[PDB]
Design a protein around this ligand. Structure first.
Ligand SMILES: COc1cccc2[nH]c(C(=O)N[C@@H](CC(C)C)C(=O)N[C@@H](C[C@@H]3CCNC3=O)C(=O)c3nc4ccccc4s3)cc12
Ligand SMILES: COc1cccc2[nH]c(C(=O)N[C@@H](CC(C)C)C(=O)N[C@@H](C[C@@H]3CCNC3=O)C(=O)c3nc4ccccc4s3)cc12
Lengths: 297, 299
C-alpha cells in the first residue's frame, strides 16, 4: 500500500495567479470566478494586524492582476467571503470541471496540488489531522494551492492553503474561506492543539491487513463503542463517531469482521503493544489511509 | 518533506484504451501513434508461450479497437518495437505535450500514472530499484500505464507497465519496449535479482531531514569514501561513487555538512540501528528520493 494522489489534470486547468502590487499567490478559476486567499491585498506592514475590511475598501477591480500564464483575465467584480477573495472575471474558464466545495472532517484524506505563481509543481496525498493541521510540503509562494478529491469526474475542493505553523505543519481554509482549526490569517506564530491518532483510519489499515492475509491480531473479544472510546482517549486515540462506524461498513462486510470486534482487536494492541511483530510489514500502525483509500486501492 | 509526484495533466490527455479480442489495456497516444504493450494481441492461451512476430502477422488493422474516451480512433497501420506495439491512427492527439522517450538508470525516480480502461486512477512516485523492479501499486488492467518525469513542460516518458512479480513488485519496459531487468513478457512466475539499497538516495534524504530541522542522527565523526563503501556493501547498499559525492554537493553546501560526514552518520545508523527513533516520521531509511528530488522540493 502507498499514498496515491488523484490525477491532477482537472485541477491544473483551473490554476491561475493573482497579484496585488508585488504580492502574488495562486488562485482557483472556476466558471467566471477566481478564488484566492484574501491576504493577497496585504503589504508587509499589513500582515501583522490586518484590517481586511479597510484594506479591501481601498481596492478596486483594476488593482487586481489575474493571469492564466501570462494572459491577463480582466477583473469585473470583487468580494470577500471569510478568508477568501472572490474575483469575478470576464471569461468563464473552459476547463472548469464538474465541481463541488466541501468541508472535510479530521481523518479524511485529499490530494494537494502544490503551485507557485499559478504553475503546478507537484501532487501528493494529505490527511486532515484531528488538530486541523496537515503535514504538507509547502514553500514561500504556495498559498492558494488547493486540496481536492475526485469522485466520478466531479472534483470536490476541500482545502486552500494559507499558513505554515512554527512546528512545520500547515493550516488553511475550505473554499468558503473558513479555517480548519483555530487559526487566523495574520503574520503570527500560532500553535495547534495536541494531535491524536486517527482511530477510524487505523481500523481501516487493520482491515487492509486482514484482506491481505495478515490477521494474527484478530482476537476472540468484542467491546461496546462507549467502552472503546474511553480506552482510546487514554492512549491519545480519537474517539469513534457514528459516521466512522458506518464508513467502516464496507470493509467490515468484505472481511466478515464486525467493526466492534476490530475495535477490541485494536484495544488489545493499544494495551499490550505489538511484541516486535509487524502488521503489513510495518512496526507502526498507519493512520493516514481512510476506508475509501483502502478500498480505492 | 513528502513523496511528491509530478502533476499528471499532460499525461492524462494522452491515455487511451486499446482492445484486441477480449484483451484490453491502456495505451499512450502521442501525435498520430498509440503505444501499448504488445501482448494486447494475446489471448489467455497465447500468453503462456507467445511467439509475438507470428501472432502479430495474423492480425489486421481492424482487429484493434482504440478508444479515447467515448471516441474510437481508426487504426491505419501498426508495427512492433520490442515489447511495445505502435498503432498508427488517423487522428492526431491535440493534447500531445512536448515529450521525449528516455531510459532511466537504477536509482532514478519517476511519477506513475496508474490507469484502467484508458482512464487515469492515481499518481505516485516510484524509483527504479537496483534490481530493476519498481515498488508500485498496480492491479488487473493496469498494463500500459506509464511513468514519466517533467522538466519545463517537456514530458520524459521512461516506463510502461507490464508485470507484477510473485513478490508483489512490478516490472516493465522503456518506451522503446525494452524491459528493465531480466524479465520477459510471458505468463510465468519470475524472480528478480537480489535487491540493494540506493545509497546516494538515503544520503539525500538524511540531508532532507536536516534541511527540515532534524539532526539527531548526525555525529562528530568522519570516514573515508572507501571505508564507508566497505561498510555499505556489507549491509547490501550500493557503492557511493565520486559522481554521487559531487551530485550531493548542493545539499552539503546548503546544510554545511560535508558528504563524508553524512556518510559517517549513515554508517553509525547502519551499525547501531535507529533504536526506535524516526527520521521524517519513517522508522526505516528511505532510499526513493534522489538528490534532485530533495533539491526541487526543499527550494
Ligand atoms: C511571525 O509570523 C510567523 C511566525 C511563525 C510562523 C509563521 N508562519 C507564518 C505564515 O504562514 N504566514 C502566511 C501569511 C499569513 C498572512 C497568512 C503564509 O502563508 N505564507 C505562505 C505559505 C508559507 C510560506 C512558507 N510555507 C508556508 O506554507 C503563503 O503562501 C502566503 N504568502 C504571503 C505573502 C504575502 C502576503 C500574503 C501571503 S500568503 C507566519 C509566521
Ligand atoms: C504464472 O504466471 C505468473 C505467476 C506469478 C506471477 C505472475 N505475474 C504475472 C503477470 O504480471 N503477467 C502480466 C502479463 C504478461 C503476459 C506480460 C500481467 O498480467 N500484467 C498486467 C498487470 C498485472 C496484473 C496484476 N497487477 C499487475 O501489475 C496487465 O495489465 C496485463 N494483463 C494482460 C492480460 C491478458 C493479456 C495481456 C495482458 S497485460 C504472471 C504471473
Amino acid at each position: 500500500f502507498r499514498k496515491m494522489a488523484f490525477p491532477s489534470g482537472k485541477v491544473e486547468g483551473c490554476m491561475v495567479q493573482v497579484t496585488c502590487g508585488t504580492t502574488t499567490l495562486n488562485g482557483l478559476w472556476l466558471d467566471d470566478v477566481v478564488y484566492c486567499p484574501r491576504h493577497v491585498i496585504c503589504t508587509s506592514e499589513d500582515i501583522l494586524n490586518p484590517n481586511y475590511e479597510d484594506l479591501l475598501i481601498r481596492k478596486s477591480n483594476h488593482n487586481f492582476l489575474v493571469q492564466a500564464g501570462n494572459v491577463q483575465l480582466r477583473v469585473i467584480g470583487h468580494s470577500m467571503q471569510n478568508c477568501v477573495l472572490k474575483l469575478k472575471v470576464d471569461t468563464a474558464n473552459p476547463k472548469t470541471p464538474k465541481y463541488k466545495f466541501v468541508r472535510i472532517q479530521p481523518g479524511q484524506t485529499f490530494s494537494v496540488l502544490a503551485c507557485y505563481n499559478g504553475s503546478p509543481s507537484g501532487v501528493y496525498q494529505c490527511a486532515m489531522r484531528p488538530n486541523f493541521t496537515i503535514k504538507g510540503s509547502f514553500l514561500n509562494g504556495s498559498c492558494g494551492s488547493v486540496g481536492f478529491n475526485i469522485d466520478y469526474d466531479c472534483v470536490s475542493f476541500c482545502y486552500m492553503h494559507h499558513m505554515e505553523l512554527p512546528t512545520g505543519v500547515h493550516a488553511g481554509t475550505d473554499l468558503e474561506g473558513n479555517f480548519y482549526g483555530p487559526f487566523v490569517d495574520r503574520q503570527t506564530a500560532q500553535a495547534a492543539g495536541t494531535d491524536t491518532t486517527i482511530t477510524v483510519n487505523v481500523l481501516a489499515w487493520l482491515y487492509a491487513a486482514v484482506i491481505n492475509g495478515d490477521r494474527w491480531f484478530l482476537n476472540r473479544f468484542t467491546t461496546t463503542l462507549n467502552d472503546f472510546n474511553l480506552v482510546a482517549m487514554k492512549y491519545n486515540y480519537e474517539p469513534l463517531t457514528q459516521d466512522h462506524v458506518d464508513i467502516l461498513g464496507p470493509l467490515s462486510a468484505q472481511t466478515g469482521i464486525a467493526v466492534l470486534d476490530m475495535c477490541a482487536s485494536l484495544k488489545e494492541l493499544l494495551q499490550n503493544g505489538m511484541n516486535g511483530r509487524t502488521i503489513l510489514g510495518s512496526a507502526l500502525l498507519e493512520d493516514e489511509f481512510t476506508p475509501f483509500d483502502v478500498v480505492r486501492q
